[PDB]
Amino acid sequence: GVYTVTVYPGDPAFEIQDSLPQKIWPMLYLHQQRWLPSYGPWHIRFTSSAMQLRNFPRSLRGQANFQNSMSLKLITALTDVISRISLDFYSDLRHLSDTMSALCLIAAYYSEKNQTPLPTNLPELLGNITAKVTLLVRDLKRAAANKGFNFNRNSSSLLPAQGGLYSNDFFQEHALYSLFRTAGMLASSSSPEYPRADSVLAITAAVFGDNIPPFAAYQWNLRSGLKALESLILLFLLLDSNKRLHLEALLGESYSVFSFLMENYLVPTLLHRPTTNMSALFPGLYLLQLEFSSGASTPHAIHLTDVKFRDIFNILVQSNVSQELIRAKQSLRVSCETGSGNLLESLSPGTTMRDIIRKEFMAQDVYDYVYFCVLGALPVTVAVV
């Protein structure tokens, strides 16, 4: 079933089957003798280095790659890889999508701070997202004064040990985990305070059922939800005169900012596609996270990141007759988690993100930032000569 989304106020509405950028990209190849789409600096270097890789799939080597453009197959493949970064590759009854885990965590916190009832279904869980994020961003400043946003990891595997728990110190130095603990959330058998009701479990039991265990007992949903929540906070901070993206020129003359995006893009997407993962909602945010995964934006650090991503992309798009593939998916996901924590640890997350998005993706204002987050690229028309 097709559904409708609007990304920016006053802008046209789009009817999509699953992904907005996947709906847009084919429309940019209907005037190939007049113009081709150009996707920006990071995309041109990525395409250029992919055309030099020995193992690079031949199906993604179209002529457009050499005309300051990308072939439709290559931009589609890249959009797919980025959208699948935070997607669970396995089936597990205990697992929620990262998006739903973040939504349960943020609704529990909002309920505890305002002494208001918990949501009991999907539409209530999707309500007042802007106020929930606003409360979380203002309260988080207190917790982030002495704590960072990166996990204390042991191995590059994403899942916890048999039993459901990570190492005792895994979440210890995380500001968002600490903020939830100060509010009485995620209590355990060894917690020092008199335990309050587990509001996250009451939400999961009501909306999803009995298969979702407590986040403190089966900690994969907590690791997953915390990083999806960091992505929503980074989106809030990024959106808080001339533009690169011109829809009239690309598609035809017929074609707060955060709150509008929530109500007209995020909420309609999750009502029609409830399992949508965070990197599929906001692929551009995951590219920004990948760019800051080393904790630096120097061309040396950017180059090393770009080499690492191109090798990962290469493995993910291979068609050759599986542990190497799993390792690559996990490595890309962990690099984005690291990048996300790094951005939030910077003095001004919004400024750091704005500097990166302007240099690597040529976004010029809030209009371009929102579209970059949803599409993963900001295409421009380039004349064919």
Residue numbers in the entry: 105 to 344, 351 to 365, 384 to 449, 453 to 516
Per the authors:
Similar to HSV-1 pUL25CTD, pUL77CTD and pORF19MCTD crystallized as a monomer. Pentameric portal caps have been demonstrated in α- and γ-herpesviruses; however, neither HSV-1 pUL25CTD nor MuHV-68 pORF19MCTD are pentameric in solution or in the crystal, suggesting that additional triggers or stabilizing forces are required for pentamerization. The crystal structure of the HSV-1 pUL25 CTD displays a remarkable charge distribution with a number of positively charged residues on one face of the molecule (blue in S4A Fig) and a cluster of negatively charged residues on the opposite face. A similar but more pronounced polarization in the electrostatic potential was observed in pUL77CTD, whereas the corresponding surfaces of the γ-herpesviral orthologs did not reveal any accumulation of charged residues. (E) View on the MuHV-68 pORF19 CTD (pORF19MCTD) shown in surface representation with residues conserved across all 4 orthologs colored in yellow. A larger conserved patch consisting of 4 residues distant in primary sequence (colored in orange) is in close proximity to the loop connecting Y365 and S384 (black arrows), which is disordered in the crystal structures of all orthologs, suggesting that the conserved patch is likely buried in the native protein.
